[PDB]
Amino acid sequence: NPPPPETSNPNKPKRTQLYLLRVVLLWHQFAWPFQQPVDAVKLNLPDYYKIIKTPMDMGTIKKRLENNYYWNAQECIQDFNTMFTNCYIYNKPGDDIVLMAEALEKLFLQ
Ligand SMILES: COC[C@H](C)Nc1ccc(NS(=O)(=O)N(C)C)c(Nc2ccc3nn[nH]c3c2)n1
Protein backbone atom coordinates (compact mmCIF):
# COMPACT_ATOMS: atom_id res chain seq x y z
CA ASN A 1 0.00 0.00 0.00
CA PRO A 2 1.39 3.58 -0.58
CA PRO A 3 1.99 5.88 2.45
CA PRO A 4 -1.40 7.32 3.47
CA PRO A 5 -2.17 10.94 2.51
CA GLU A 6 -0.54 13.61 4.78
CA THR A 7 -2.64 15.03 7.67
CA SER A 8 0.16 17.19 9.15
CA ASN A 9 2.11 19.91 7.27
CA PRO A 10 3.60 22.74 9.45
CA ASN A 11 4.62 24.97 6.49
CA LYS A 12 1.16 24.64 4.84
CA PRO A 13 -1.16 27.67 5.38
CA LYS A 14 -4.05 26.51 7.72
CA ARG A 15 -7.21 27.94 9.47
CA THR A 16 -12.91 28.91 10.02
CA GLN A 17 -17.24 26.87 8.04
CA LEU A 18 -14.58 24.16 8.88
CA TYR A 19 -18.92 23.02 10.33
CA LEU A 20 -17.59 20.32 7.88
CA LEU A 21 -16.31 18.47 11.03
CA ARG A 22 -19.20 19.17 13.44
CA VAL A 23 -22.30 18.49 11.20
CA VAL A 24 -20.85 17.09 7.88
CA LEU A 25 -18.80 14.40 9.80
CA LEU A 26 -21.35 10.44 8.06
CA TRP A 27 -18.90 8.82 10.51
CA HIS A 28 -23.57 5.79 9.94
CA GLN A 29 -23.92 2.00 9.12
CA PHE A 30 -22.06 2.26 5.64
CA ALA A 31 -19.10 4.41 6.95
CA TRP A 32 -16.80 1.48 7.89
CA PRO A 33 -15.25 0.98 4.35
CA PHE A 34 -14.24 4.70 4.24
CA GLN A 35 -12.95 5.25 7.81
CA GLN A 36 -9.37 4.32 6.63
CA PRO A 37 -7.22 4.12 3.48
CA VAL A 38 -8.27 1.29 1.11
CA ASP A 39 -6.09 -1.68 2.07
CA ALA A 40 -5.47 -3.06 -1.50
CA VAL A 41 -3.16 -5.79 -0.04
CA LYS A 42 -5.82 -7.13 2.44
CA LEU A 43 -8.61 -6.86 -0.27
CA ASN A 44 -6.21 -8.53 -2.82
CA LEU A 45 -6.72 -5.58 -5.26
CA PRO A 46 -3.18 -5.24 -6.72
CA ASP A 47 -4.63 -2.85 -9.38
CA TYR A 48 -6.40 -0.42 -6.94
CA TYR A 49 -3.42 2.00 -6.54
CA LYS A 50 -2.59 1.53 -10.26
CA ILE A 51 -6.12 2.84 -11.15
CA ILE A 52 -6.52 5.26 -8.18
CA LYS A 53 -3.75 7.91 -8.06
CA THR A 54 -5.54 10.27 -5.60
CA PRO A 55 -6.71 7.96 -2.78
CA MET A 56 -8.75 9.57 0.02
CA ASP A 57 -10.85 8.42 2.95
CA MET A 58 -12.77 9.96 5.86
CA GLY A 59 -10.12 8.72 8.36
CA THR A 60 -7.59 11.03 6.56
CA ILE A 61 -10.32 13.79 6.30
CA LYS A 62 -11.12 13.43 10.07
CA LYS A 63 -7.40 13.68 11.14
CA ARG A 64 -7.08 16.69 8.74
CA LEU A 65 -10.04 18.66 10.27
CA GLU A 66 -8.75 17.89 13.82
CA ASN A 67 -5.11 18.74 12.84
CA ASN A 68 -6.31 22.10 11.36
CA TYR A 69 -4.82 20.93 8.01
CA TYR A 70 -7.16 22.87 5.67
CA TRP A 71 -7.31 26.58 4.65
CA ASN A 72 -10.92 26.50 3.26
CA ALA A 73 -14.05 24.21 3.09
CA GLN A 74 -13.50 24.02 -0.75
CA GLU A 75 -10.29 21.95 0.15
CA CYS A 76 -12.04 19.49 2.51
CA ILE A 77 -15.11 19.25 0.19
CA GLN A 78 -12.79 18.37 -2.76
CA ASP A 79 -11.29 15.50 -0.58
CA PHE A 80 -14.86 14.14 0.13
CA ASN A 81 -15.50 14.49 -3.67
CA THR A 82 -12.22 12.54 -4.40
CA MET A 83 -13.28 9.78 -1.88
CA PHE A 84 -16.75 9.25 -3.57
CA THR A 85 -15.31 9.62 -7.18
CA ASN A 86 -12.44 7.15 -6.51
CA CYS A 87 -15.02 4.59 -5.43
CA TYR A 88 -17.22 5.04 -8.62
CA ILE A 89 -14.14 4.89 -10.99
CA TYR A 90 -12.59 1.71 -9.47
CA ASN A 91 -15.98 -0.10 -9.33
CA LYS A 92 -19.13 -0.66 -11.55
CA PRO A 93 -22.59 1.01 -11.08
CA GLY A 94 -24.70 -0.92 -8.49
CA ASP A 95 -21.79 -2.65 -6.62
CA ASP A 96 -22.30 -2.98 -2.80
CA ILE A 97 -19.41 -0.54 -2.24
CA VAL A 98 -20.87 1.91 -4.86
CA LEU A 99 -24.26 1.82 -2.94
CA MET A 100 -22.49 2.53 0.40
CA ALA A 101 -20.70 5.64 -1.10
CA GLU A 102 -23.93 7.04 -2.72
CA ALA A 103 -25.75 6.73 0.66
CA LEU A 104 -22.96 8.74 2.43
CA GLU A 105 -22.72 11.15 -0.57
CA LYS A 106 -26.52 11.90 -0.25
CA LEU A 107 -26.16 12.45 3.56
CA PHE A 108 -23.12 14.62 2.47
CA LEU A 109 -25.27 16.70 0.02
CA GLN A 110 -27.32 17.59 3.23
C1 LIG B 1 -19.19 -3.71 0.43
O2 LIG B 1 -18.14 -4.53 0.89
C3 LIG B 1 -17.25 -4.69 -0.20
C4 LIG B 1 -15.88 -4.06 0.03
C5 LIG B 1 -15.17 -4.14 -1.32
N6 LIG B 1 -15.10 -4.71 1.14
C7 LIG B 1 -14.29 -3.97 1.89
C8 LIG B 1 -13.63 -4.49 2.99
C9 LIG B 1 -12.80 -3.65 3.68
C10 LIG B 1 -12.65 -2.32 3.25
N11 LIG B 1 -11.91 -1.43 3.88
S12 LIG B 1 -10.23 -1.43 3.91
O13 LIG B 1 -9.72 -1.34 2.46
O14 LIG B 1 -9.92 -0.23 4.78
N15 LIG B 1 -9.72 -2.78 4.87
C16 LIG B 1 -9.50 -3.96 4.03
C17 LIG B 1 -8.71 -2.45 5.92
C18 LIG B 1 -13.35 -1.83 2.14
N19 LIG B 1 -13.18 -0.54 1.81
C20 LIG B 1 -13.23 -0.07 0.55
C21 LIG B 1 -13.30 1.32 0.42
C22 LIG B 1 -13.39 1.90 -0.85
C23 LIG B 1 -13.36 1.14 -1.95
N24 LIG B 1 -13.40 1.47 -3.25
N25 LIG B 1 -13.35 0.35 -4.00
N26 LIG B 1 -13.25 -0.66 -3.11
C27 LIG B 1 -13.25 -0.18 -1.84
C28 LIG B 1 -13.20 -0.80 -0.64
N29 LIG B 1 -14.15 -2.67 1.51
Q: What is the spatial distance between Cα 49 and Cα 68, in angstroms, rounded to a whole number?
A: 27
Instruction: Yes or no: say if 46 and 22 are a contact pair by the CB < 8 Å rule.
Output: no
Handedness of CA 72, 57, 65, 5 (dihedral sign): negative
Ligand 1 pocket residue status of 69, Cβ below 6 Å: no
Residue 91 lies in a domain: yes
Q: What is the spatial distance between Cα 41 and Cα 75, in angstroms, rounded to a whole number?
A: 29
Ligand 1 pocket residue status of 90, Cβ below 6 Å: yes
- Structure-solving method: X-ray
Helix, strand, coil percent content, the chain, rounded in steps of 5: 45, 0, 55
Instruction: Yes or no: say if 51 and 57 are a contact pair by the CB < 8 Å rule.
Output: no
Domain that holds residue 72: 18-109
Q: Domain of 98: which CATH number? A: 1.20.920.10
Question: Which among 73, 75, 79, 105 is positioned nearest to 5, based on CA atoms?
Answer: 79
Residue 9 lies in a domain: no
Domain count, the chain: 1
Instruction: Yes or no: say if 20 and 73 are a contact pair by the CB < 8 Å rule.
Output: yes
Residue 5 lies in a domain: no
Residue 2 lies in a domain: no
Atom of ligand 1 nearest to the CA of 97: 1
